[PDB]
């Protein structure tokens, strides 16, 4: 029978491919969830396993966990369980706006961030203080962001016309508008900031710890 027995991979980094694979699956599940929010459809765990993480089912807690967190913080969407393994997706703080009219990425998350920034400067925040905080998270005046669009139009026009905000000549400054006061409160925005800052952070597992879920 005798043949050629001499000796993976050729050589490729399986460990770092793994954390990238998980991180891409966080991105992918997040976009999937946004679609489910747009469709006003419920979402089941089973659906998520079958349709998005068929090949990493046991990582569900971590991939779903981080995708949820991104929905909350970036998009202002809360992934609410029903209690089951079904979940509905609704805007944070009960806000009625998401900016889908852009029929893709909700802008609730950035509204919430601008409302919190004013809530923290007290009764009003200056134009400059709003641009600084938007800057720290990569949103700049006159620069069309992919997820949020052009922000000056967004702050100064859309959100003024929608009455979430007021923008006036005092330097310039922003204040909550009647809709913002109607739909939410300073107390609720600040408690939300507080709950987000205090959240249990999720670590990506190593290849070893992930093998230890079976």
Swiss-Prot record:
Reported tissue expression = Expressed in many tumors of several types, such as melanoma, head and neck squamous cell carcinoma, lung carcinoma and breast carcinoma, but not in normal tissues except for testes and placenta.
| Record note on what altering residue 65 to D does | In a breast cancer sample; somatic mutation
Q: Name one GO cellular component term.
A: nucleus
GO biological process, alphabetically ordered: negative regulation of apoptotic process; negative regulation of transcription by RNA polymerase II; positive regulation of cell cycle
Organism domain of life: Eukaryota
- Where's the MAGE domain? 22-211
The entry lists its GO molecular-function terms as: histone deacetylase binding
Keywords of this protein's UniProt record, alphabetized?
Answer: Tumor antigen
Q: What does this protein do?
A: Regulates cell proliferation through the inhibition of cell cycle arrest at the G1 phase. Also negatively regulates p53-mediated apoptosis.
- Protein name stated in the entry: Melanoma-associated antigen 4
Q: What is the lineage of its organism?
A: Eukaryota, Metazoa, Chordata, Craniata, Vertebrata
Part of the intact protein present: 101 to 312 of 317
């Amino acid at each position: 029978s005798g043949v050629d027995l001499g000796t993976y991979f050729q050589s490729m980094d399986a460990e770092s491919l793994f954390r990238e694979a998980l991180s891409n699956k966080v991105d992918e599940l997040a976009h999937f969830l946004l679609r489910k929010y747009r469709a006003k459809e419920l979402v089941t765990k089973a659906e998520m396993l079958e349709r998005v993480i068929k090949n990493y089912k046991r990582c569900f807690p971590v991939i779903f966990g981080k995708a949820s967190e991104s929905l909350k913080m970036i998009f202002g969407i809360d992934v609410k369980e029903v209690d089951s393994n079904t979940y509905t997706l609704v805007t944070c703080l009960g806000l009625s706006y998401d900016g889908l009219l852009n029929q893709i990425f909700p802008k609730t998350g950035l509204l919430i961030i601008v409302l919190g920034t004013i809530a923290m400067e007290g009764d009003s925040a200056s134009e400059e203080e709003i641009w600084e905080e938007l800057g720290v998270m990569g949103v700049y005046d006159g620069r069309e962001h992919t997820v949020y669009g052009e922000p000056r139009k967004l702050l100064t026009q859309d959100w003024v016309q929608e009455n979430y905000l007021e923008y006036r000549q005092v330097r310039y400054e922003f204040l909550w508008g009647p809709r913002a006061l109607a739909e939410t409160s300073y107390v609720k925005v600040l408690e939300h900031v507080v709950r987000v800052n205090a959240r249990v952070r999720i670590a990506y597992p190593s290849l070893r710890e992930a093998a230890l879920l079976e």
